[PDB]
Amino acid sequence: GQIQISKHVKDVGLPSIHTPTKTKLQPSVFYDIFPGSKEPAVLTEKDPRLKVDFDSALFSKYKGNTECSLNEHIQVAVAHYSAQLATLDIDPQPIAMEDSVFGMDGLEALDLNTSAGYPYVTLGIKKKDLINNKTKDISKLKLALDKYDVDLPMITFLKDELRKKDKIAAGKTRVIEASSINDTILFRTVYGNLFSKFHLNPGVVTGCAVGCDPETFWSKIPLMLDGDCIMAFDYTNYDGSIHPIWFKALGMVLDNLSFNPTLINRLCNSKHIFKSTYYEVEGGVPSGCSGTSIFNSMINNIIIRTLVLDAYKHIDLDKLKIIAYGDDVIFSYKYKLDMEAIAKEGQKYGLTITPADKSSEFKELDYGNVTFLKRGFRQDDKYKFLIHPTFPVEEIYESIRWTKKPSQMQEHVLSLCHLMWHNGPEIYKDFETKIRSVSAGRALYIPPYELLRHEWYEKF
RNA sequence: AGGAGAUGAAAGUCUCCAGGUCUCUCGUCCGG
RNA sequence: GCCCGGACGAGAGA
């Protein structure tokens, strides 16, 4: 995250971009029944709740880059992770346009419901206008691709979500980086085969959790991290604190898999437009690009290997087991390591690592206090080899208070019941009861705790 | 400001639209 | 009924 250049769009022959300002979120019929502090993020400087300058708060996350270079440990990390991935036997060959657009085994189709990016967003062109899902006609898309070529600027948008109260006045809204459909397709065509293999193989070989079902995967994890010390921690602004050298690393891994290692320099050194400002950034993974999840994850796997090599002199990398989902990571070693000491080593690279789940200091962890993807671990009372993914009840209460689709609070409630019941019968009982304390809740179908339970057992 | 539409003979007026890459899960529907 | 395939929505997570 180093801003290199910053210009007015007109002085580069670029349009301004309409940036949305209204939230889709609104209070649900349960707004008053459950406790919660969260509210929609700030989307404009004219938000009354805002107690600071919005732009200065938005772009404050771009600091600079620490002075570091590659080194032998990073090169060892690359060598080791590269060796792992090769065992998967990934085809480095490109994929056909048809697969880039409509998907293939382990690659979803393009999202026809989201923006097409620059320049279509300034010309009233939607993805659906370029792609006819029902006839698979892509004549219009082919025409656009030729017309505007590639490496178009990503467009900065504000993410419309609930945030904690303390992110509202502070104006700490998360930003999104919109990839042009031209570029998404391009990255898919080159890297599709890699993305797919990752999607189809969550676990300790990909070093990646993307593509897992927590309800069934949670029982595999203690088998995959067979180790003695199990550990986890937190990144302060992971994506923007990625130094260009991790990108050189990622490239080296890609190269060892016989993929193209240069396209990703469009992520390291990226073009963006925010409203009427054109800018370019050196460093940081532009969350919103093609492959954010995979590339962020692959990178984490290098970092963690490097950090451990830095902190400990005689390590067995084969017994350092890692699973990552972007910035989120859980890992193990065969003996006990000092999380505190490892986190320290990230500092010289520009990484800020903190005790997992907002502790004040680093404490030991086991499958009792550790979490991944917001979920905890706890064994079934009947089958001790089956592990529940626990979910924070506070977040369930915050979630139910808001809705983006009033006419389907039923679907909403069902999604939460499937999260909640893993926490146990009596909390689930209480949840049901609170729901039915009002008329709207009693109108709703709610799955019985035992129905949920047995359905869970049948998946094993 | 751009796009789409409504209105008007026109001049004009009016209304709507815009928000990433993904994973899993649930609901509904059509299928083999 | 199970398995998979599509479509339309939603919720959570990164």
Residue numbers in the entry: 1 to 460
Text taken from the publication that reported this structure:
The replication of positive-strand RNA viruses relies on virally encoded RNA-dependent RNA polymerases (RdRPs) that are capable of rapid and processive synthesis of the 7–14 kilobase viral genomes. To examine this in further detail and to validate the polymerase–RNA interactions seen in the initial poliovirus EC structures, we here present nine new coxsackievirus, rhinovirus, and poliovirus elongation complex structures at resolutions ranging from 2.1 to 2.9 Å. All of the complexes show the open conformation for the active site wherein the β-strands of motifs A and C are not hydrogen bonded together to fully form the RMM-fold that is commonly utilized by polymerase active sites.
Using the r1 RNA used to crystallize and solve the initial PV polymerase EC structure (i.e. PV_r1), we were able to also crystallize the RV polymerase EC (RV_r1). The RV EC structure retained the coaxially stacked EC pairs seen with the original poliovirus structure, but note that the two RV EC pairs are in a very different spatial arrangement than previously observed. Note that the NCS pairs in the RV_r1 structure are in different dumbbell pairs while those of the other structures are within each dumbbell pair. The RV_r1 EC is the only structure where we observe significant contacts involving the downstream template duplex, but these appear to be non-specific interactions with other polymerase molecules in the lattice and not a biologically relevant interface. The contact stabilizes the orientation of the RNA helix, resulting in strong electron density into which we could build the entire 6-base pair hairpin and tetra-loop sequence.
